[model samples]
Target: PFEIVFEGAKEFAQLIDTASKLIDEAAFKVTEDGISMRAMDPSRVVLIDLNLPSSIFSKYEVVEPETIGVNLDHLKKILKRGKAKDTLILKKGEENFLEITIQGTATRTFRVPLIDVEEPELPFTAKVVVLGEVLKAAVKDASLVSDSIKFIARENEFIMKAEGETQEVEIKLTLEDEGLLDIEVQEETKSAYGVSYLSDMVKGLGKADEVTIKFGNEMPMQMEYYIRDEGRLTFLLAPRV
Candidate 1:
């Protein structure tokens, strides 16, 4: 028997919801180290890499490392039945099923059968640290006029710009900016990406205040953020052109 207990059930629900934005099913690797998964969208436009350390859970017990495949959309629905403060318990049953138990003022349980999917490798370059809110605001503002957003990394600052038939929006931040934490560029680089995918990926930011943005010219973009002492979420989006 294997079981893991999470203190914040709502966060788990949000995690699955964000994950479903890119893929319908996911294969999770559970071990003494923690739980981790990586998946890509069917359109091959975005990739997700997620990890939750064993330390994040109040209780973690695993006799051996195991891999389980799950339909994220269905799992998300089951998780939504829980409240934010409810305790979430996940157990691997003898019948090759996952049992989800929610404990709050009341107790509830659900079960889901396992499945399988293909996993792909993602290659990325370049990295920078910026506030989640800053990135969110920039994407939202850019989407107002264009279907794509351009990203640039210089020695002194990072920039985002978008252009439409009659309007253009540009956002620039430097190391001195309160939300801009660190800027590292081996050489000046720039790339363009679809805004819709980027917007959906950022929705997974939850309570993370800061995130690292990584990308280079014509390369896939990777964004990473940590959930305090819990786990981390990483996203990779392909360039538009």
Candidate 2:
């Protein structure tokens, strides 16, 4: 038997959404090092590098050695059925399936069978690391101004430029807004991202207070849920035309 604890069910839900967007159907890999999986899409345009630590799961349970491919949509539906206030428990079961336990006044349970599908291998070339953060609503709001948002990073400042139907939304973060919170120019790197994808991607994120963005040009961008704890979603995309 295995058990895990979450402060809220929503944590699991976001993880599921992020997972579904990146990986199709997959299983957990546990070894002496911990748990990790490197999966990419067919076109190699996107990749999902997951590293789930056993310690992160309060009640660690491993019944057997196995590999299962679960339909991402099925898992998403199960999460969607969960009430925001309801706590959740997930367990692997017999017949190569999963059992979901919802905690609430009216408790409900669900069992979903795991499926199999082939996925692309992880990309091992062309990689760059970026370390910076941006506000979610600010970026999304900026995106509204134009079909694409220009991201400029230099020295220690972050600037966003966008033009929409009504007006323009430009935000410059330096050491003035709130000292360190102000729009301070940092490393000088400028690029644009599609407003459409940026909008859809930031939906689940902006629900909370704010989102911190870490990204680069023609590279994967990571949006962090910097609340009490840390939950993050990284988007890997090719350059826009």
* Candidate topping TM-score: 1
Clashes of each: 0, 23
Consecutive 10-residue window with the lowest summed lDDT within model 2: 122-131
TM-scores for every candidate against the unseen true structure? 0.89, 0.70
Give a tens-digit lDDT track for model 1, residues 1-241.
Answer: 5799999898888888989988889999998999999887888888789999999999999977889999988899999998989999999966678999999999999998888766724443456898887888877897757888889889888889854465888889988887788988878878889988888887756433788888887788888888645689988788863
- lDDT of all predictions, in order shown? 0.84, 0.55
Question: Runs in model 1 with CA error above 4 Å?
Answer: 118-126, 163-166
Candidate 2 residue-wise lDDT, 16-105, digit = tens: 676666556766554433355556655555555555555555455666545556777788787776666777776765577778777766
Model 1: weakest 10-residue lDDT segment is 117-126
RMSD of each: 2.4, 5.3
